């Protein structure tokens, strides 16, 4: 599941730069009012460097 | 596209009665607007900003308003206590039902 | 943590509160405030924090 | 007309009209398969030939 993918860090993950998926993830990862924290982990992985 | 010299008498007559009116302008790219806020403000401030959205007035054409409301609701910046006023001169019954 | 910051207090209605802001901005931009902080929170203490 | 994997979004829907959706969107992930855990000689692995 995406939750389990967000807990682990042994396998890195990413997407195509600036694609609609990248904006969609960044929209959630920064949001402090989101009910589900998962995306804050997904964003914290994708955004490195 | 709005010419703010319309509300120029409303802000005047309101600011004598002690209300904390704020302006803002709605961008063409509403997603880049909202994502600028979470990227450029403290959590100390976002919780003050949410308290202002409790009451708001939207002065725009319906096709923009539908899109803005849908995004503000999907981003959970408002909840069941909010009370927004929408004002315009031309809205047909097909749009009210959306 | 949000909603808090360190400070100091004065009498009810003390006008000397007008001094702080611009001078604190000076001290922060000069690093004088950071020099005082380093004076009172130096890194290589007796132990790793 | 336009037809593709084109996705309805609140910013696109401003300038062009859309019909009712004929299939739902979904974000997902591609991963490489894990390979079988079982092996015939797993008990002889600890030392090289």
Curated annotation (Swiss-Prot), chain D:
Ca(2+) 1 binds at residues 13, 16-17. It is found in: Postsynaptic cell membrane. Member of the ionotropic glutamate receptor family, which plays a crucial role in synaptic organization and signal transduction in the central nervous system. Although it shares structural features with ionotropic glutamate receptors, does not bind glutamate as a primary ligand. Promotes synaptogenesis and mediates the D-Serine-dependent long term depression signals and AMPA receptor endocytosis of cerebellar parallel fiber-Purkinje cell (PF-PC) synapses through the NRX1B-CBLN1-GRID2 triad complex. It is linked to Spinocerebellar ataxia, autosomal recessive, 18: A form of spinocerebellar ataxia, a clinically and genetically heterogeneous group of cerebellar disorders. Patients show progressive incoordination of gait and often poor coordination of hands, speech and eye movements, due to degeneration of the cerebellum with variable involvement of the brainstem and spinal cord. SCAR18 features include progressive cerebellar atrophy, delayed psychomotor development, severely impaired gait, ocular movement abnormalities, and intellectual disability. Belongs to the glutamate-gated ion channel (TC 1.A.10.1) family. GRID2 subfamily. Tetramer; dimer of dimers. Interacts with EML2, MAGI2 (via PDZ domains) and AP4M1. Interacts with BECN1, GOPC, GRID2IP, SHANK1 and SHANK2. Interacts with CBLN2, but not with CBLN4. Interacts with CBLN1 (via C1q domain); the interaction is CBLN1-NRX1 complex formation-dependent; CBLN1-binding is calcium-independent; CBLN1 hexamers anchor GRID2 N-terminal domain dimers to monomeric NRXN1 isoform beta; promotes synaptogenesis and mediates the D-Serine-dependent long term depression signals and AMPA receptor endocytosis. The PDZ-binding motif mediates interaction with GOPC. This is Glutamate receptor ionotropic, delta-2. It comes from Homo sapiens. The gene is GRID2.
């Amino acid at each position: 599941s995406l939750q389990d993918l967000s807990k682990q860090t042994e396998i890195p993950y990413g997407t195509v730069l600036d694609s609609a998926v990248y904006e969609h993830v960044r929209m959630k990862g920064l949001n402090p009012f989101e009910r589900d924290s998962m995306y804050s982990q997904m964003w914290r992985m994708i955004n490195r460097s | 596209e709005y010419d703010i010299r319309g509300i120029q008498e409303f802000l005047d007559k309101v600011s004598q009665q002690g209300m904390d009116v704020a302006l803002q302008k709605v961008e063409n790219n509403i997603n880049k607007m909202i994502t600028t806020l979470f990227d450029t403000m403290r959590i100390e401030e976002l919780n003050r900003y949410r308290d202002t959205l409790r009451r708001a007035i939207l002065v725009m054409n319906p096709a923009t308003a539908k899109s803005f409301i849908t995004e503000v609701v999907e981003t959970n910046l408002v909840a069941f206590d909010c009370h927004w006023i929408i004002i315009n001169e031309e809205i047909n019954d097909v749009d009210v039902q959306e | 943590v949000a909603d808090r910051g360190y400070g100091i207090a004065l009498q009810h209605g003390s006008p000397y509160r007008d001094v702080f802001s611009q001078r604190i901005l000076e001290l922060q931009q000069n690093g004088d405030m950071d020099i005082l902080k380093h004076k009172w929170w130096p890194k290589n203490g007796q132990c790793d924090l | 007309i336009g037809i593709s994997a084109l996705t309805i979004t609140p910013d696109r829907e401003n300038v062009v009209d859309f019909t009712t959706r004929y299939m739902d969107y979904s974000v997902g992930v591609l991963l490489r398969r894990a390979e079988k855990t079982v092996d015939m000689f797993a008990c002889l692995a600890p030392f090289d030939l």
